[PDB]
Design an enzyme around this catalytic site. Structure first.
Site, PDB file in Angstrom:
ATOM      1  N   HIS A 217       0.847  -1.221   0.000  1.00 37.49           N
ATOM      2  CA  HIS A 217       0.000   0.000   0.000  1.00 37.49           C
ATOM      3  C   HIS A 217       0.873   1.260   0.000  1.00 37.49           C
ATOM      4  O   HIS A 217       1.869   1.298   0.744  1.00 37.49           O
ATOM      5  CB  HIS A 217      -0.989   0.002   1.173  1.00 37.49           C
ATOM      6  CG  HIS A 217      -1.897   1.184   1.146  1.00 37.49           C
ATOM      7  ND1 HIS A 217      -2.562   1.562  -0.001  1.00 37.49           N
ATOM      8  CD2 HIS A 217      -2.231   2.089   2.092  1.00 37.49           C
ATOM      9  CE1 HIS A 217      -3.276   2.641   0.240  1.00 37.49           C
ATOM     10  NE2 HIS A 217      -3.093   2.985   1.520  1.00 37.49           N
ATOM     11  N   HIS A 261      -3.720   5.683   6.698  1.00 39.32           N
ATOM     12  CA  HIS A 261      -2.503   5.403   7.508  1.00 39.32           C
ATOM     13  C   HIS A 261      -1.988   6.726   8.078  1.00 39.32           C
ATOM     14  O   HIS A 261      -0.870   7.141   7.786  1.00 39.32           O
ATOM     15  CB  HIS A 261      -1.480   4.660   6.635  1.00 39.32           C
ATOM     16  CG  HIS A 261      -0.335   4.043   7.369  1.00 39.32           C
ATOM     17  ND1 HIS A 261       0.881   4.693   7.522  1.00 39.32           N
ATOM     18  CD2 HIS A 261      -0.189   2.827   7.942  1.00 39.32           C
ATOM     19  CE1 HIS A 261       1.715   3.909   8.180  1.00 39.32           C
ATOM     20  NE2 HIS A 261       1.083   2.757   8.445  1.00 39.32           N
ATOM     21  N   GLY A 268      -3.006   0.035  12.627  1.00 40.57           N
ATOM     22  CA  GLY A 268      -3.792  -1.209  12.711  1.00 40.57           C
ATOM     23  C   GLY A 268      -4.572  -1.282  14.011  1.00 40.57           C
ATOM     24  O   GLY A 268      -5.810  -1.429  13.954  1.00 40.57           O
ATOM     25  N   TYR A 297      -5.835 -11.532   6.388  1.00 43.51           N
ATOM     26  CA  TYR A 297      -6.065 -10.102   6.725  1.00 43.51           C
ATOM     27  C   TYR A 297      -5.350  -9.205   5.706  1.00 43.51           C
ATOM     28  O   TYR A 297      -5.997  -8.304   5.129  1.00 43.51           O
ATOM     29  CB  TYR A 297      -5.609  -9.865   8.168  1.00 43.51           C
ATOM     30  CG  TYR A 297      -5.718  -8.457   8.697  1.00 43.51           C
ATOM     31  CD1 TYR A 297      -6.836  -7.673   8.465  1.00 43.51           C
ATOM     32  CD2 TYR A 297      -4.713  -7.928   9.493  1.00 43.51           C
ATOM     33  CE1 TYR A 297      -6.938  -6.389   8.978  1.00 43.51           C
ATOM     34  CE2 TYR A 297      -4.798  -6.648  10.017  1.00 43.51           C
ATOM     35  CZ  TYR A 297      -5.917  -5.875   9.760  1.00 43.51           C
ATOM     36  OH  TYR A 297      -6.012  -4.616  10.276  1.00 43.51           O
TER      37      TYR A 297
END
Ligand SMILES: Nc1ncnc2c1ncn2[C@@H]1O[C@H](COP(=O)(O)OP(=O)(O)NP(=O)(O)O)[C@@H](O)[C@H]1O
Ligand SMILES: [Mg+2]
EC number: 2.7.7.108
Length: 334
Positions: A217, A261, A268, A297
């Site tokens: 990502h 983020h 997380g 996940y």
């Protein structure tokens, strides 16, 4: 086609300036120069829909989606699979709805439930830190939180991650769950301040200011983090979001935050706490993503990044059922 690209850019400029007759002629010119120009077909579709030309708009959208014969087949086959998938997914939400009502119906004072709620609380902290490499055992985490004496020859960083999760969960349970009104950016910062404070108090409760890589990502440039966090909390409090099924809402909240983020670390943990705040506010118990599910996940997060969030929603749905099954199965106490 260089002329097609130019025609489209100029069509969007004329649409912005409100001259729609000149916009239309440039949209037509773009498609004359490149009949398979997806960007121009979609934009000319949007333009058509604004004028309430629904047939033309649908024609242009469908044309954009079916450039080559394999696209044609993909649309035909997807239109067949979609209703079957909608029905499979909706079934699974109704199974979860049934098990939530069974857990909620159990009287709060019950001896069996209260023993299990305590045991799973420590289980949940174990999984939320163990999934990012924390090597503490379940018994060590119970020791750290029940006694508030440290454990031998295990890093203070790992132990302070546990203390932070405990602090963050208590803060949510006491202050946020029952509280009426909107979820603010400061509420997210307050959770992060507790999650990361005991490990990195300089960065806790503070957005990052540097470019980062999260696995596969690319999160936004730090310059854009605040803007996207404002749009995020708008969506959180939006009428659309409150109409979603709690598990979907909680799943999308989690995904949207880890996508942005916004912190340098603890993204997380914060996202999973925000996920469980939303579920608790909807009367569901807090759910766990087990350490063992790390690979799954990451796979469903990567699939979400590349334009399908449904595998992530299903994964969170799966995790919710596993939690409810664990609460319900502990009628072995009773
Ligand atoms: N491809 C991805 N796209 C979006 N988010 C991702 C992706 N891969 C991982 N993540 C999330 O980013 C987290 C890691 O970011 P970080 O800021 O270190 O959080 P953490 O709370 O320290 N780690 P963790 O306990 O594993 O959630 C992962 O745990 C996921 O929740
Ligand atoms: Mg981390």
């Amino acid at each position: 086609s260089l002329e097609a690209r130019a025609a489209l850019n100029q069509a969007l400029e004329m649409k912005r300036q409100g001259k729609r007759e000149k916009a239309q002629k440039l949209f037509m010119h773009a498609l004359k120069m490149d009949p398979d120009f997806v960007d121009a077909l979609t934009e000319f579709g949007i333009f058509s829909e604004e004028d309430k030309d629904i047939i033309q708009a649908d024609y242009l959208y469908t044309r954009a989606l079916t450039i080559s014969p394999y696209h044609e087949k993909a649309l035909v086959n997807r239109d067949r699979t979609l209703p079957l998938v909608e029905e499979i997914d909706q079934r699974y939400f109704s199974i979860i709805d049934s098990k939530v009502k069974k857990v909620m119906s159990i009287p709060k004072g019950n001896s069996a439930l209260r023993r299990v709620m305590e045991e799973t609380y420590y289980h949940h902290i174990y999984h939320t830190v163990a999934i990012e490499g924390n090597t503490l055992t379940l018994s060590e985490i119970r020791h750290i939180l029940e006694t508030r004496y440290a454990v031998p020859g295990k890093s203070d960083e790992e132990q302070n991650e546990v203390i932070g999760m405990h602090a963050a969960m208590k803060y949510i349970n006491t202050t946020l769950v029952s509280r009426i009104g909107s979820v603010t950016i400061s509420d997210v910062l307050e959770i992060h301040r507790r999650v990361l404070g005991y490990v990195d108090p300089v960065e806790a409760g503070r957005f990052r200011t540097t470019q980062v890589l999260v696995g596969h990502h690319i999160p936004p440039h730090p310059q854009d983090v605040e803007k996207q966090m404002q749009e995020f909390v708008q969506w959180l409090n939006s009428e659309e979001a409150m109409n979603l099924h709690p598990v979907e809402f909680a799943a999308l909240a989690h995904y949207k935050l880890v996508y942005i983020h916004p912190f340098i670390d603890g993204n997380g943990r914060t996202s999973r706490l925000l996920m469980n705040l939303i579920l608790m506010q909807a009367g569901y118990p807090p759910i766990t993503i087990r350490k063992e599910q790390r690979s799954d996940y990451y796979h469903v997060l990567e699939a979400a990044n590349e334009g399908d969030v449904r595998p992530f929603i299903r994964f969170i749905a799966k995790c919710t059922e596993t939690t409810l099954d664990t609460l319900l199965f502990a009628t072995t106490e009773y």
